[PDB]
Structure formats: structure tokens, C-alpha cells
Amino acid sequence: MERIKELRDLMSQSRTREILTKTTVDHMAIIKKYTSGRQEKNPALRMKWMMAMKYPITADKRIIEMIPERNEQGQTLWSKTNDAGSDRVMVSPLAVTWWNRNGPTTSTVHYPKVYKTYFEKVERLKHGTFGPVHFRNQVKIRRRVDTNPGHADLSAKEAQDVIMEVVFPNEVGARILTSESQLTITKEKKEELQDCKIAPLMVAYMLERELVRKTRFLPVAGGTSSVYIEVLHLTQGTCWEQMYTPGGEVRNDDVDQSLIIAARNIVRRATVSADPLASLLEMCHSTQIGGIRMVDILRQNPTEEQAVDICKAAMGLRISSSFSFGGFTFKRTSGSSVTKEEEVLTGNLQTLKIRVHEGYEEFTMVGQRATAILRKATRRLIQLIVSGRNEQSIAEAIIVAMVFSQEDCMIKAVRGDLNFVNRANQRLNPMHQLLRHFQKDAKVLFQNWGTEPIDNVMGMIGILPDMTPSTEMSLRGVRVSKMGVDEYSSTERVVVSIDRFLRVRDQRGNVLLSPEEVSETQGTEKLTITYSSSMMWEINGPESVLVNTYQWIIRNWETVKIQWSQDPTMLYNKMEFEPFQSLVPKAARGQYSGFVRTLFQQMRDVLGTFDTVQIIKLLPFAAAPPKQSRMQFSSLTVNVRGSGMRILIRGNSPVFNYNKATKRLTVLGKDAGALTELRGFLILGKEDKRYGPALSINELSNLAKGEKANVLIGQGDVVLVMKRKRDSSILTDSQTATKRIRM
């Protein structure tokens, strides 16, 4: 009631009305920065001066009614002076202690959970373990490491969407309501901070401090974790190392490796297709890693792996200029190069075609367990300085540089036939073939490289061909460095053109990440990968096939139910169940199917037997040319990696268990999803008086599936809104309209 009076009196004078009417809500933050005053140079001096006088600290005009003007000894706690221009009365610091002693108590249960990012530190140090101090000469490389444990791997922009939805529910914007990404954290925090009276702005700040990651490029000398870098001041020193261990909890970096696996599979199956771009984009916009759409993950994570790099590049995202070879990423600092595919002969007089990198260039060869700086000219390993832990890592870095030295000595020193194939049985890059040929043994290559004297400059142990120290004799251009070699503090993100064969060239014309140097391993992802195409399901093995089939049935439960109860024949022959029928034994697909079909019919005849879980469990066996037999099966077999798993008709089993007391279904341990045994709105126009006065984003909870109401969206404007019918997503439907024209 007073604020509207304030607005009226502001508008009364016709000079602030211009600012208050012509400044769109967009141009408010740029008006908020026209502050007055001169701030204050030398604030410590000003504080030491202020505390000398009385009444230093300003407080709002409420102390007057809850803090006596004098304590029980006659000392004026607060004054009445109205600092500068404001209602804030001046106050002496005695008032702070008076409040802290004779003040209104309260219950603080929301503090240990709003300020989780500090009590976590407290409880992590309280359980830390200490070890002996070792006074060895410490070597401190300059790694760029995470400095915010438990950051919840959100970016700096979706964290804002989480804050606006937990602390400011009535100011949410269009981009959130008219969406279908609720996130899980926003449902936990909304429940926890349900009655907090702390400081909405402070709650927002703490949430964005907890839900963001940061890096600092610090002189680390071990650990490198997200928790070992907060206690860097305690663990390492210029001449000491105090062995230490935080005792809290860690993050599971499994989403990143799941993303890597999904990207690898997608790129393979898109390049083996007719139009790689369409397959890549459709899969990215459709495939989901553990429920989340892969596009969100790609736009969220910073993971730098080949397959993920190609996936991002095909989606028009900036990718690091650094190229990864042999597990080490090579940041160019200077020079130019040209691929210039030329011909050479190997040690066994075998013809070979390799991109002779023509041009002098210097690289920082940063890696997981080693670092190096390598400057080389065309077929000239000019200099290579290496550092790391133990001589194994040093040898790995040296051999990687030697392989990518462009020297023909390695080519002519080959021992064997350079015919290497990968898991997919493909023709790998000849330089890469050399890399794996020499990755095991290079003794003869070391002998060919020879050894030269070193002058002992500043202290730099040389490396012998036997990978042993030597203060006088060292390999050619290889100078193992003490006191560590520092990494780099930047990645130089750039946009790189992508050819049609998954070879990520650049505007300069140097290949960064060829598609053949990606099949390092094909292990099993920890999360679940779900694809929207029936063909993709038979890629990662029987486990993925079963999980995807059941998750698809769950995804479309209402359609499956209506078709099963109305037109069962059409349902029982869909395409999505053909991959599943590949697993079921050939000699029992019929006998099984009939048993299910007949049983399903029993549900339609007698009411009250409509069991959702049973139907979802048994449905994939229906798709077959059913036969008839009196046999009453107890469990239906399935073939998984040559082993016969069993699905129980009445009960739970490893292949399928729907956990009660919850809606979650698990298949072979892999999480399937939720089965049921705010958002989603659509804008329609500006204010329309036919629908009455405007609402608030809260009241929109009371609407039907199609009712139209006009709401005050976000900070300001009112827009007519309505709930949506049909999912209305951006899946293959959008691609069809776009890819069809691309014919």
C-alpha cells in the first residue's frame, strides 16, 4: 500500500516519469548502475576512524522498537541521525552485542542446509586424517583444477533457472514454464527450503555458490581432486608436504564416461549411414543418458573426449583447438603446419602414406601423468623437455613425442609389418599404426636415436635409452626436466569445420581428431543410454536391448494400454519388439507368445485383473507368430551374451524387478525408469480482458488440461496462457520437416 503511493509520487513529478515509462524492463539493470557517491579509497583507515567515534554502524528503523536506547549501565546503544539520506538510524556496536545477548532467540534448523557448502567443509575437515610431514624438495606443477567440491555439475546459466524456480517461484519466466525440464535438484531444494525466512537473496547466492564449478590454475603437487585443492594451503608447501585426506564424500564422474560411450556409438552408426549429419543430430536430440536428453548434457558438461568432440562439432559448438594424440593433448603455442600426405618406406620395405607435417611448431603436450614441451620442424625433433612422476610416465611422454616427431628414423626402424586393425577391423592411420606398433617396445628405436652429451645446465637430469638417469649422456633432443614443467592456463576454444567422414579439419587445414583414433575401449557404461530408434537398441548388447525395450514401453504406457485393450493385434506386431524377439529362443517364440496372448485375453474378459506391471513385463513376448500348447509356463527364457536368463511371470527376477514402495523399475541392475502402477504451458497472446484479471504463476496450478488463463509471466508483462495437449517436443518430428527438404 505504501509502495504504490511511492510509485504515484514518483510519477507525479514529470522528470522521473520518463525514466519510469520509457525504460523497458530489459533496460533496468543498466539503469541500476547509475549509482552516486565515490565509494571509498582506503577502507581500512576509514574503519579504524569510524570505530573511534560512536554510532558507526547503520541499522534500519526497527531497533527503536526492539532495542532499548540504553543498556543496564546507561550506554546509548543507538542514536537517531538517519545516516546521509535514508531511514537507517545510526547505531553503536554495543547494540550488536546487546542483540547477541539479550535478544530474540530463534530456531536455526534451516542454516545447516542452506549453507551446506560450508558445513560440508567443516564436516570434511573434522574427519580428515593426517600423516607425517615429508621435507623432500617439492615439485609443484601448475595444474588447472576444480575448486568447488560437490558443484552438482551445472553450468552458470541453468543454475539461474534453478534459483528462479526455488527462491522466486512467482517470478519464473516463459523459458521455464513453457518447458519440460524440471530437473531433480529443483524438486529437492524446493522441498528443503519450504519455510526458510533467511534472506531470499542470500538463499539464491548460496545456491548458486553450491551449484557451480570453478577452476583456478593453481600450483598443485599431487592429489588434483576437487577436495584436495581447498586444503592446498595445508597439504603442500615450498619445502614440505603434509600428507592429508579429506573425510567427506566424493563425486562420481560417471555421467561423463557414459556421455563418451554414447557419443562413440552415435558417431559410428552415423558415419556408417548415408547422411551422417541427420543421424547425428536426430540421435543427439533423441538419445538420453540416464533420462537427461543428450543435447542438454552436451551443452552442460566440459568433457573433452574425441567422440564427444565430434558430437559437439556436428552440433555447431566451440571445440578446443588442442588435438589429443596418444592420450596427451597438444596445445600449439607457435608455428604453422601443413598435413601434406607423402609416401615413405617402413623398416620392412613396406610402402606407407603419412601426413608429413611440414612447418616448425611448438606444442605443450599436457597429459594425465606427465607434461612436456616439444618444438619440432619438418622431420626434425628440435627439442623435447619432459617431466612427471616416475620414469614410466616420462618414457610414455617421450615415446608419444617421438612417434609424433615426423622423423623418418622411427619409420625405418620398424620391426614387423605395420598392418594394425582395431576392434571394428578398420584401416587405421599409418602414423597411428606406428604409434601402437612402438607403444610397447622402442629399444631399437632408442639405439637408432642415439645419445649425446649434456652440459648440466641449471640441473636437468638426462634420460638414457634404457630409461635411466644420466647427468652427462642423454637421448637426442630429450631433456628430462626437474622442478616440473608447467601446463597451460587456456584452451583457445574455436569453431572447426567438419568434413563428411568424421574428420575434424579446421579453417587452416590440420586434422585435430580423426574418427579412427576413438576406439580405445568399448566397455560397459555405468548409466543407461536410451535411443528413440528401434534399430539402435541392438548396438550395446542384450542388456541395452532389454532396457531400451522396457523403457520405451514405459514411455508410451497410455498408448500401449489403449491399443492393448482395443486393438491388440496391431500392438502385438510393432517394430519395436523385433529386436527383443532376437533374444528370445527361436524354438519358443511362438509357444511363449501364445501363452502371453491368451493370458492377456484373460485380462480383457474378467475385470479387476488389469495388472500394469504384468502387462509391461510380458508384452514383448507377444510379438511373434503365436502357437498353441497346453504348457503353462512359469518363467520365459532370454538369451543374453550366451547365458540363459529367466523372466518370472508372477514375481521379480534380475532381468526385471519393479520395486514396490516406489515406482522404479530395474532391468539387469540398469535403471529403467518410473512406472505409475508448474510447467508445460503455452503462450497465446497479450492481455485479453475476456478471461478476467491476471493471475500469478502460483495460481496457474488450478487449471484443467486446456483451460486458458492470463498470467503475469516473469518480471512484468502479462501473457495469455494455456495448458498443452500432446507432448509437443522437438524430437524427430522437427527433423522430418527439415531433413525431408534436404533431399
Binding site: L648, G651, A661
Partner: protein
């Protein structure tokens, strides 16, 4: 949601005479007893009182047709004599996670005529020596104790 509520929530506007399987777990007990169920439940044959804080089964209803009762995760420390008379046809009992601490406590079950399984996991009585043999001698009709019959052969499925 205590029992009286969830019962109705699980009644689903369906008369008690037409329930054959009722599930009431994690809900509550008034103080330590089942309250909300009534004798009009006559068609019931599967009652699951799991995790309901339950100190005794003194005030259990009378269910002629009950065959699958389970009181796991509760804190019953005796008073099982009632189950005999009140559930004459019970044939699958699941007393796992309770506070039973003596073979004597299982004496009342000897007079159930049709008994086929008695799960007794995580109960202080299972730490005794010759535990299974003593139970199988106190309850001769039993044919599956904890899941295995007499020679540690798992009970066949489809029970």
C-alpha cells in the same frame, strides 16, 4: 497416513467383502496395535503389515480366508497365540526383522494346522545353535523355514 486412512485409501470405494489382497505397509499403528481393520473383511487372503510400527497383534481382526500374512520390519516380541485362532487357514507367515528372542515365543504357532512357510530372518532367535532343527521339531507341519525345506534346498517357486 495412519492405518484408518490408508485402509480407506486402499478400500478404493470397494466393499470390504470384495477385497482379496490388501497391502498396508509403512503406514502406522495407533500406539502398537492394528486399528482400522474390521471383521467385515471376509474375502481377504493377503494382508501385508510391513514396517508398521507394531508392538503386538492383540487386536487383529478375524480373517477366515487369510493365507499370506507378513509382519516383517515390525517390533513384535510375543503374543503370537492370537494368530492361531484368528487366522485358522494361514499358510504363509513372514516374521522377519522382529524382536523374537526365544524358541518358546514360537510355541503358539504349533497349533496352526495348515502352515507351509515361516520366514524368521534377522531375529535374535536365529543366532542359536541347532536353530532350524529346533524350529522344525517345534513346528512339525512346517515344510519351508526361511526359504529352504530340510536339506537347504530352496523352496520351489510358484507358491
Amino acid at each position: 497416513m495412519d492405518m484408518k486412512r490408508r485402509i480407506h485409501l486402499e478400500l478404493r470405494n470397494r466393499t470390504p467383502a470384495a477385497v482379496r489382497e490388501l497391502v498396508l505397509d509403512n503406514c502406522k499403528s495407533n500406539d502398537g496395535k492394528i486399528e482400522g481393520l474390521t471383521a467385515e473383511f471376509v474375502n481377504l487372503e493377503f494382508l501385508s503389515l510391513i514396517n508398521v510400527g507394531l508392538i503386538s497383534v492383540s487386536n487383529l481382526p478375524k480373517l477366515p480366508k487369510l493365507k499370506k500374512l507378513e509382519l516383517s520390519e515390525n517390533r513384535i516380541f510375543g503374543g503370537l497365540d492370537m494368530l492361531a485362532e484368528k487366522l485358522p487357514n494361514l499358510t504363509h507367515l513372514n516374521l522377519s526383522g522382529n524382536k523374537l528372542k526365544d524358541i518358546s515365543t514360537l510355541e503358539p504357532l504349533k497349533k496352526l494346522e495348515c502352515l507351509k512357510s515361516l520366514d524368521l530372518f534377522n531375529c535374535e532367535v536365529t543366532n542359536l545353535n541347532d536353530y532350524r532343527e529346533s524350529v522344525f521339531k517345534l513346528l512339525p507341519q512346517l515344510t519351508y523355514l526361511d526359504g529352504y525345506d530340510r536339506e537347504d534346498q530352496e523352496a520351489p517357486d510358484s507358491d
